[PDB]
Amino acid sequence: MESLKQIHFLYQYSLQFFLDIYHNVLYENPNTDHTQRLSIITKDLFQVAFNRVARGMLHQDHITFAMLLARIKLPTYDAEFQHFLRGNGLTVEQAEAVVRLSCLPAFKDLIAKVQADEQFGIWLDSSSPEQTVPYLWTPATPIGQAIHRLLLIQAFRPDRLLAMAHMFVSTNLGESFMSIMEQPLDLTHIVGTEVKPNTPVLMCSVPGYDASGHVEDLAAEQNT
Amino acid sequence: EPPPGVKANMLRTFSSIPVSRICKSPNERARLYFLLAWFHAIIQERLRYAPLGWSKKYEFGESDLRSACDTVDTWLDDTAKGRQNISPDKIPWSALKTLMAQSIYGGRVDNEFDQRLLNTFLERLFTTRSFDSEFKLACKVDGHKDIQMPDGIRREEFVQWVELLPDTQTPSWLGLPNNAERVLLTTQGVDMISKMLKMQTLHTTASNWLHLIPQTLSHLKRIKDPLFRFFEREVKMGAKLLQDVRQDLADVVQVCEGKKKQTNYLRTLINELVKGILPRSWSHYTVPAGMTVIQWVSDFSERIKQLQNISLAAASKELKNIHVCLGGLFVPEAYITATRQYVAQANSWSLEELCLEVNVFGVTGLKLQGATCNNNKLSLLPLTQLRWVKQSVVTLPVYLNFTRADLIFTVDFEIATKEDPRSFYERGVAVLC
Amino acid sequence: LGISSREGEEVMFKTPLVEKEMRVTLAKLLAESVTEVEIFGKATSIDPNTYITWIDKYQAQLVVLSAQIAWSENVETALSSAAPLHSVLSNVEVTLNVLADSVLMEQPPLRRRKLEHLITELVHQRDVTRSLIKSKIDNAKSFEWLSQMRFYFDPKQTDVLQQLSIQMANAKFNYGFEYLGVQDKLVQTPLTDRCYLTMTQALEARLGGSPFGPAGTGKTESVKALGHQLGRFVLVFNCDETFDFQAMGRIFVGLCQVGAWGCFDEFNRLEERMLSAVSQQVQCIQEALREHSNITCELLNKQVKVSPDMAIFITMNPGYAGRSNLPDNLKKLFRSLAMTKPDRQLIAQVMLYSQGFRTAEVLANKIVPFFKLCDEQLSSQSHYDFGLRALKSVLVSAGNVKRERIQKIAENLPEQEILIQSVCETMVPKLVAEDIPLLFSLLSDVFPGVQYHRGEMTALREELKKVCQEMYLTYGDGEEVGGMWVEKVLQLYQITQINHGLMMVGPSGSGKSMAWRVLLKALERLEGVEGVAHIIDPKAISKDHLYGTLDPNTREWTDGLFTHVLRKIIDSVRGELQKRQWIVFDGDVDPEWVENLNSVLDDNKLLTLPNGERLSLPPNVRIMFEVQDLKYATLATVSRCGMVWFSEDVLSTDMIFNNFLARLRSIPLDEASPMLQIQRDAATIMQPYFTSNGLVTKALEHAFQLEHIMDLTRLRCLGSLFSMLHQACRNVAQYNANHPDFPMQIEQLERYIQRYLVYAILWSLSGDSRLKMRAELGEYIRRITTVPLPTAPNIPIIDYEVSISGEWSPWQAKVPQIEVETHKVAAPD
Ligand SMILES: Nc1ncnc2c1ncn2[C@@H]1O[C@H](COP(=O)(O)OP(=O)(O)OP(=O)(O)O)[C@@H](O)[C@H]1O
Ligand SMILES: Nc1ncnc2c1ncn2[C@@H]1O[C@H](COP(=O)(O)OP(=O)(O)O)[C@@H](O)[C@H]1O
């Protein structure tokens, strides 16, 4: 979370941020067995950390940092996972992306599979390829599968990559892990919860949108 | 920020609207608010897919929707003050449509094509047919699906209808033909990758780029006709800019070769060249913003070949027959008016009384973005003939660039029968040079 | 007792405080005027023997308002009951026809303005009625009629302020009845209607209206025109950095106290600080008056009563270089509107019919595409404007040329030639030479035939001859050596009659200063009126020095340069108003000071102060800018004023040579005397060189083929040559003084001056260059010159001095090989 500053000038976070996050996720955990408590808090730390971080972040990276939380829900698949960061019939761009993806053993057979799977050729023209991905690649878990699907969509249909990444975040942390953002920020609740006195409330707005109009309504809401 | 997708802004709009206001009767009001909200969402996403969604990136902020709500409230309150129901036909559809197209969401609209496309959408949405249970808000996707307008009469049903929208949204909800993402996300995904990958000599540099430029740009050779004067002026500008830029580049090369000459202007020019940015001193003809020096040199080579051919043909008057490249010239509007004057003189009509017809003066290089045909029946350009004559069609723009920033040449094409002309404005069609 | 109207349309009170008096008088007069104009409303055919009397009995604003009220009542009654609509159309058409026939004949003063006003008003009414008829409306309260500016009058209304009401789309205003004056009426185009619609919306919403777009499309004019259409007095403020947060607060306090309309020209240079503070203030007052609609407001930490009639208006020109962005919390407080292309064809049609041209429709339909074609065609120079301002100026020129031709002679006057004569008056001057072959040819293809030849004020020509001979300048008449320059001088004389505001533009060494000097002196001789000038350099002093500054702690505005010159002018203690008074700016362009003049180079010629003090330009005053080029000027700067392009060929080489010879012959170095005698002799020696090709022009043109350490300009090096030839004459004077009994004769002076002049050209031209370039100019001079030159086969010509005996001498005679003191081997000096 402190390494986020490399991407933006607004991505400055303190240790008090994390102290408050853990204090609330502990004292205000939604639950009384010890193992139950630990599993619930293991999920709830991820959830509350994501919510608090991304409510003060621009949308284009709301997925980004989120997926890095899924980087630390991994048994482990780092050797093939770190490829799509290393490297960055079919079209030239798709051809080179696929040949680069072929470096890993798991997709080493793609050179044959794409030649055999005509339904893959049809899927290349699918409107929502992420929702239905063929598996052209010895057990396999849901999370390892989803990592393979991210790598496949990167190789073939990067236009929908950001969509498929959401599913990867669902494969590890939950489909409802991200659903808390598609709604108006309940400023009353978040202000009463996270904002103690001496904490200045910063409302930063992309140009063309004013934030002040919200808070005045809140001032009308609370009769303050 | 404005949210992503239609559903998010719709839910935010319902959240912002106090329930005490929207709930008040007549019930019709509630539906109209939803309609307004839906429309706003389309606008709020079309901006994200410029220039196809909007040629000019206008802002449509909170105050626009607030004035929209005030306008709708005033119209409906004064229409049937005191009643408990308004018939679908009795809503002042035209009045609200006009106040929408001209002031609120058209006040910031300046280019008449955008003002045309706002009126198109307003005609599509704000009608009596909206109160029909079979009314379709838009086409869902290419696969024979349509967003059916909710038949409820309460926000307690409209809000739920908005929640149950599909996850796999595409621009087709907005009328765009689902292609902005093919670039936009195609960039963002790569950017996303780079972001996590970021989370976990001047003289030699100039010389490498400047060594082969002299082998790229060739060298140019230099009565009262309306055509022969303009092309003489244009090739004069071409030769001037060619000699200036080529001399500057050769002098930079000599600086890199080691023959001193490191003057102030040459120092600045080297500093700009090594970064690959276009020197602002050379911006003598409009180009896309942020264009690189390599793109500039390629365009300059093509323009030099064009003007060399123009000079060789004109020297041989014959400028009605010699081909041209609209947009490949430096001031194409001057060329268009030169053709106007040539037709006016050649057969002795007055200029004010002329108008243009086009079909497939011989001009090449254009390309129709957002439509295609082969019989002047546009459906949702190797050679073009233009003529001027005295005194189921679509009025299209023609822009010099590929960013739709400069309206230069208006055209009126003929569409095929089965296409709604309205769809040609929702699809954001135009012609690029 | 009455009101002393500026134009002459006086007003007399019904009961001969002041604001109530004028409001009551205007209201009762309006009631009488509408009670009279209903006759023409119902009349089948209008006789001018009553129509002109009714027009003369009342004022311009009053007669327009009465006509508007009667037409609105007639249309509404016709819709309530296509027969009656066609009847109303016939009535208004008959009124328009009789008015358009009346304007053909000359009229007394203060009447033709009213006739033009009513022509505009009636064509607007006819357009609305015809549009309503074509899209047939049966319902009285349909939107397509409700959305136009409707007028209603109820005599039952006891108090005399509220009888008239204006109604618009979901809006109801009350006409101010404040005295507005004549000014002029703007043609009602679609975009003006859009402005009225949104502005009315914002006013009913207690907000402000923000027109924006390219400069010079009627933003401030639309605002002020609508203010007149509501009877509200409009105040235009020249916004700029000088306006601190307290100044604008005082302005708002005054606006709220008086309830006027606050027109602002450019909210793009107040800086973010005084922009955000103003945002706070406007939000405060807006909310206060919103509470009033459903009061006191805290302006500058003071509770002040505020009237409901006040309003804020924010003109802007986003997109230009010298402009700043805005906060969003301010932008949400103003209803914005983009204007980019006012419909010019209808404007020209209505204006030409207002003047009464026979074929006004055809003239408009030709002149507007002429503007578009010329703008699309001609070269992309940095000061070419063909927007709405040029169209208005050429139309007013056409009107004045019509009046001049009528006074020269009447009903069969050709009018295409009038348009051609106006275009050549106002559009040809700005053109570059390369743009003359196109433009005239374009006029051939928009106005076939109707060939035109310019007149001439030969009295001015002879006066210019006299002064030009006085000032040792060369004179011509159109095609001689002095032809082009004097022709441009007459062009400037023509332009100053129209554009109260003007720019002489061209590269250095063109004769702009001389041009306006000779014109001022010649006009002074011709009309016998003191031509007084005030020259100001803009950048040589601070902008604050240029305009002045307000102390932050009291009311003491220390005047700047321009403001003090103005204050002296309009004070006119010395009868300055009875003199042709010009303020000439000479320097370069910077918006930071140029766009502070944007309210005094425009139709409403008037600038404002942070204190609120207002200064208008009297009619005699002209503002003139002498400028090299326009690399850093917005479109507003170019559009505000007329142009004169002084190309580099306005002064031929022989022109300056002859001026040098004349100055040499006439005036002495110390003021045939001795100095004068030697001057005339030397001028005689060099006369075959200071003319035509000769040697001096050849060398001067050769000098631009060689490399220089700085930019070679002709006039710099030629002034150098002139000064050092003056020193040659001084040298001869000293020689004669050295022999009081053996003065120099012709046989010596000829050799001396010839060799001196050759050396002078060779050095002064290549005065700043490397050794090889000086040697190259020496070789050129050897090739061209006729004077004998040193015979050394390898010594550069620059390595010889000219002896007072007139003989070349190597410089090695003047370089003694000395041995300095060992005490001072390398000491200073
Ligand atoms: N028509 C003319 N005949 C003779 N000499 C002239 C004429 N016009 C200008 N000159 C001389 O040319 C020289 C430069 O002209 P002038 O003094 O008018 O400069 P200017 O217009 O202010 O120049 P700049 O454009 O460089 O600011 C002066 O010596 C002036 O006397
Ligand atoms: N409808 C019209 N008909 C004729 N002339 C007009 C019309 N509207 C504006 N003009 C002219 O356009 C000019 C520009 O007005 P203005 O809005 O004050 O420019 P800006 O505010 O950009 O400085 C004025 O000089 C006016 O005479």
Backbone φ and ψ for A196, nearest 5 degrees, come out as -80, 160
Q: Report d(CA B60, CA C381) in Å as an integer.
A: 36
DSSP β-ladder status, C234-237 and C502-505: unpaired
Amino acid present at C341: K
DSSP letter assigned to residue B224 = -
Q: Report d(CA C51, CA C37) in Å as an integer.
A: 9
Q: Report d(CA C2, CA C14) in Å as an integer.
A: 9
Which two structure tokens, joined as six digits, stand for C726? 């003056």
> Are B94 and C370 inside 8 Å of each other by CB?
no
Resolution (A): 4.0
Technique that determined the structure? cryo-EM
In this structure, the number of other CB atoms found within 10 A of the CB of residue C287 comes to 14
Q: Looking up tokens 């011709």, which residue turns up?
A: C526
DSSP-derived secondary structure for B399-418: ESSSS---B---EEEEB-TT
Distances (CA, A) of B193 to A5, B198, B248: 16, 9, 40
SS3 C150: strand
Residue of B nearest to C381 (CA): B284
Output the ligand 1 site: residues, CB below 6 A: C 473-474, 485, 508-514, 651, 655-656, 659, 715
Amino acid present at C130: R
> Are A59 and B186 inside 8 Å of each other by CB?
no
SS3 C212: strand
Helix axes B228-257, B332-347, angle to 10 degrees: 150
Three-state SS for B99-123 is: HHHHHHCCCCCCCHHHHHHHHHHHH
**Does C290 contact A at CB distance below 8 Å?**
no
Q: Is residue B176 within 8 Å of B428, Cβ to Cβ?
A: yes
Helix axes A15-27, A34-54, angle to 10 degrees: 140
Q: Report d(CA C405, CA C411) in Å as an integer.
A: 11
- CA C755 to chain CA centroid, Å, is 51
Q: Report d(CA C153, CA C147) in Å as an integer.
A: 18
Residue C485 contacts by C-beta under 8 Å, 6 or more apart in sequence?
C476, C511, C515, C650, C651, C655
Q: Report d(CA B82, CA B77) in Å as an integer.
A: 8
List of long-range contacts for C71-76, beta carbons under 8 Å, 24+ apart: C71/C41, C71/C125, C71/C129, C72/C150, C72/C151, C72/C152, C73/C38, C73/C41, C73/C151, C73/C152, C73/C153, C74/C41, C75/C128, C75/C129, C75/C132, C75/C145, C76/C140, C76/C145, C76/C150
Backbone φ and ψ for C179, nearest 5 degrees, come out as -65, 115
Report the candidate in A212, C145, C524, C308 with the shortest Cα–Cα distance to residue B63.
A212
Q: Looking up tokens 């000071």, which residue turns up?
A: C593
E-strand stretches of B237-282: none
Report the candidate in B298, B339, B333, B355 with the shortest Cα–Cα distance to residue B406.
B333
Measured CA angle at C589 (ends C378, C585), to 5 deg: 105
Residue B215 contacts by C-beta under 8 Å, 6 or more apart in sequence?
none
Report the candidate in C147, C153, C169, C139 with the shortest Cα–Cα distance to residue C79.
C139
Torsion of CA C560, C562, C568, C569, to 10 degrees: -170
List of long-range contacts for C50-56, beta carbons under 8 Å, 24+ apart: C51/C95, C51/C98, C51/C99, C51/C102, C52/C102, C52/C111, C55/C111, C55/C114, C55/C115, C55/C118, C56/C108, C56/C111, C56/C114
DSSP β-ladder status, C234-237 and C261-264: parallel
**Does A176 contact B at CB distance below 8 Å?**
no
How close are the terminal C-alpha atoms of chain C, in Å?
Answer: 84
SS3 B351: coil
Q: Looking up tokens 């022009």, which residue turns up?
A: C697
Alpha helices in C156-239 (DSSP H): 190-204, 219-229
Q: Is residue C691 within 8 Å of C654, Cβ to Cβ?
A: yes
Cis? peptide before B51, omega within 30° of 0: yes
SS3 B421: coil
Q: Is residue B365 within 8 Å of B328, Cβ to Cβ?
A: yes
Q: Report d(CA C755, CA C802) in Å as an integer.
A: 7
Q: Report d(CA C661, CA C346) in Å as an integer.
A: 58
Distances (CA, A) of B223 to B227, B231, C441, C447: 9, 12, 12, 21
SS3 content of chain C, % helix, strand, coil (to 5): 50, 10, 40
Q: Is residue B203 within 8 Å of B254, Cβ to Cβ?
A: no
DSSP letter assigned to residue C806 = S
What strands lie across the sheet with C531-536, from one edge to the other?
C531-536, C580-587, C622-627, C502-505, C642-645
- Ligand 1 binding pocket mutation candidate from C489, C656, C720, C723 (most atoms within 8 A of CB): C656
Q: Report d(CA C334, CA C336) in Å as an integer.
A: 6
SS3 C424: helix
DSSP β-ladder status, C334-338 and C208-212: parallel
Report the candidate in C652, C649, C653, C666 with the shortest Cα–Cα distance to residue C472.
C666
List of long-range contacts for A112-115, beta carbons under 8 Å, 24+ apart: A113/A137, A114/A89, A114/A90, A115/A89
Ligand 2 geometric centre to CA of B409 (Å): 26
The partner residues of B385 in beta bridges, in order of sequence, read B359, B362
Report the candidate in C62, C68, C54 with the shortest Cα–Cα distance to residue C27.
C62
DSSP letter assigned to residue C351 = H
Measured CA angle at C269 (ends C264, C275), to 5 deg: 75
Q: Report d(CA C413, CA C94) in Å as an integer.
A: 24
In this structure, the number of other CB atoms found within 10 A of the CB of residue B52 comes to 21
Ligand 1 geometric centre to CA of C486 (Å): 12
Chain C residues in contact with B331 by the CB 8 A cut-off are 380
Q: Which atom of ligand 2 is nearest to the CA of C602?
A: 25
Nearest CA to ligand 1 atom 4: C473
Residue of C nearest to B233 (CA): C379
DSSP letter assigned to residue B292 = B
Amino acid present at B42: I
Minimum-distance ligand to the CA of C190?
Answer: 2
Q: Is residue C190 within 8 Å of B96, Cβ to Cβ?
A: no
DSSP letter assigned to residue C305 = E
Report the candidate in B178, B173, B51, B120 with the shortest Cα–Cα distance to residue B420.
B120
Q: Is residue C120 within 8 Å of C350, Cβ to Cβ?
A: yes
Three-state SS for C499-544 is: CCCEEEECCCCCCHHHHHHHHHHHHHHHHCCCEEEEEECCCCCCHH
Q: Is residue B419 within 8 Å of B380, Cβ to Cβ?
A: yes
Q: Report d(CA B85, CA B83) in Å as an integer.
A: 6
Gyration radius from chain B CA atoms: 28
Ligand 1 geometric centre to CA of C512 (Å): 7
Distances (CA, A) of C306 to C21, C227, C255, C261, C296: 22, 19, 8, 13, 6
**Does C329 contact A at CB distance below 8 Å?**
yes
Greatest alpha-carbon pair distance for chain C in Å reads 120
Partner residue facing B1 (CB), from A58, A84, A160: A58
Q: Is residue C195 within 8 Å of C227, Cβ to Cβ?
A: no
Residues across chain C: 829
Nearest chain B Cα distance for residue C303, angstroms: 29
Q: Report d(CA B235, CA B251) in Å as an integer.
A: 24
Residue B221 contacts by C-beta under 8 Å, 6 or more apart in sequence?
B308, B311
> Are B4 and A85 inside 8 Å of each other by CB?
no
DSSP-derived secondary structure for B1-18: -PPSHHHHHHHHHHHHS-
Greatest alpha-carbon pair distance for chain B in Å reads 90
- With 0-12 / 13-18 / 19 or more C-beta atoms within 10 angstroms meaning exposed / middle / buried, residue C91 is buried
Backbone φ and ψ for B298, nearest 5 degrees, come out as -65, -45
Q: Report d(CA C81, CA C137) in Å as an integer.
A: 12
Q: Is the dihedral of CA B220, B222, B227, B233 positive or negative?
A: positive
The partner residues of B136 in beta bridges, in order of sequence, read B148
Distances (CA, A) of A162 to A151, A158, A172, B181: 12, 8, 16, 10
DSSP-derived secondary structure for chain A: -GGGGGT-SS----HHHHHHHHHHHHHT-----HHHHHHHHHHHHHHHHHHHHHTTS-GGGHHHHHHHHHTT-----HHHHTHHHH-----HHHHHHHHHHTTSSTTTTHHHHHHH-HHHHHHTT-S-GGGS---------HHHHHHHHHHHHHHH-GGGHHHHHHHHHHHHH-GGGSTTSSS---HHHHHHHH--TT--------TT--SHHHHHHHHHHHT-
Q: Is residue B340 within 8 Å of B377, Cβ to Cβ?
A: no
DSSP-derived secondary structure for B362-391: EEE--EEET-B-SSS-BB----EEEEEEE-
Q: Report d(CA C390, CA C426) in Å as an integer.
A: 8
Q: Report d(CA C391, CA C422) in Å as an integer.
A: 10
Q: Which atom of ligand 1 is nearest to the CA of C586?
A: 27
How close are the terminal C-alpha atoms of chain A, in Å?
Answer: 35
Measured CA angle at B408 (ends B402, B414), to 5 deg: 85
Q: Report d(CA C827, CA C829) in Å as an integer.
A: 7
Distances (CA, A) of C150 to B74, C32, C73: 19, 20, 9
Q: Report d(CA B167, CA A170) in Å as an integer.
A: 14
DSSP-derived secondary structure for B28-97: HHHHHHHHHHHHHHHHHHHGGGTTTS-SS-----HHHHHHHHHHHHHHHHHHSTT-S---GGGS-HHHHH
> Are C336 and B107 inside 8 Å of each other by CB?
yes
Q: Report d(CA C442, CA C372) in Å as an integer.
A: 11
Which two structure tokens, joined as six digits, stand for A155? 């190789």
Three-state SS for C605-666 is: CEEECCCCCEEECCCCCEEEEEECCCCCCCHHHHHHCEEEECCCCCCCHHHHHHHHHHHHHH
Q: Report d(CA A166, CA C724) in Å as an integer.
A: 85
Q: Is residue C490 within 8 Å of C461, Cβ to Cβ?
A: yes
Chain A residues in contact with C329 by the CB 8 A cut-off are 210, 212
Q: Report d(CA C732, CA C748) in Å as an integer.
A: 10
Q: Is residue C505 within 8 Å of C605, Cβ to Cβ?
A: no
Q: Report d(CA B223, CA B246) in Å as an integer.
A: 30
Amino acid present at B62: E
C697 is in an annotated binding site: no
Which two structure tokens, joined as six digits, stand for C543? 């902008």
**Does B145 contact A at CB distance below 8 Å?**
no
Distances (CA, A) of A137 to A147, A148, B356, C120, C808: 12, 8, 60, 80, 99
